[PDB]
Structures are given as structure tokens and as C-alpha cells.
């Protein structure tokens, strides 16, 4: 059935909104959040961050039509956005980045309030 449920249609839009953000130079912000490097590749991130999240992690849940509800898919967004900015320092553009994809998210659930 190619027809989704408001909820699911909701779920969507907010995901979409974060994923497609770009900035006034096109850059978007999304890019390095989709897919977290390996632990191989990044040793010091698992060792630190106890509950890893990506992006494509997000979209698997939500694909799998596994969200209840908003609420649970902006836990796990806000998990990421926090993992982000205590890996990386305050100074650094990855961690700029995860503050402005978290308004994104928060202004996206709010203008949506009355769907
Ligand atoms: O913190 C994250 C990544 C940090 N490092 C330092 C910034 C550049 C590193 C990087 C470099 C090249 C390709 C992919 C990722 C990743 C991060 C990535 C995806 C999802 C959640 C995250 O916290
Ligand atoms: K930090």
C-alpha cells in the first residue's frame, strides 16, 4: 500500500526537513550525520558515546514503521545531536552543525503542532 498514515506522513516530513536542511550556500548539513564511521575507523567515538545514532539508523526505525509517535523519533534525533556535540568541541563545525539541524527539528515539530 503506497498510502501513509498521517502519523506516518508526519513522521516523514520531519525526517525529510533535518535530511534536506541546506544552508544559504547550499551545503547541507546533513551530510556527515547520515552514516557514522565505523568503530574501526573512529575507535575514541564508541569507547565514549554510549548510545551510537545515525541518520540512516533513524530511517531504518522509521521505515520499519517502528515510531509510536513524534516524541520518538525526536529522542533518538536529539541522542544524535548530543552524541555529536560531546564527541566533538564546541569550536568545531560538526558540533555548529548539530545545533542548527536540532532547531531545524524543533521548529519543524512545532510548526507542525496543528499538523
Ligand atoms: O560526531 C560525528 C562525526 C565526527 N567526526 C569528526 C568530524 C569529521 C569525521 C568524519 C570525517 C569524514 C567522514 C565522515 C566523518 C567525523 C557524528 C557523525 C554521524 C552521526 C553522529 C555523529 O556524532
Ligand atoms: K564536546
Do not use: W
Request: hydrophobic letters at 35%; aromatic letters at 10%; a neutral charge.
Amino acid at each position: 500500500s503506497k498510502y501513509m498514515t498521517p502519523m506516518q506522513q508526519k513522521l516523514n516530513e520531519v525526517y525529510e526537513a533535518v535530511k534536506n536542511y541546506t544552508d544559504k550556500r547550499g551545503r547541507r548539513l546533513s551530510a556527515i550525520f547520515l552514516r557514522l564511521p565505523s568503530r574501526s575507523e573512529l575507535p575514541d567515538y564508541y569507547l565514549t558515546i554510549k548510545k551510537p545514532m545515525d541518520m540512516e539508523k533513524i530511517r531504518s526505525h522509521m521505515m520499519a514503521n517502528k515510531y509510536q509517535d513524534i516524541d520518538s523519533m525526536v529522542e533518538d534525533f536529539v541522542m544524535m545531536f548530543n552524541n555529536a556535540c560531546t564527541y566533538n568541541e564546541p569550536e568545531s563545525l560538526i558540533y555548529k552543525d548539530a545545533l542548527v539541524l536540532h532547531k531545524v527539528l524543533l521548529e519543524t515539530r512545532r510548526d507542525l503542532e496543528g499538523d
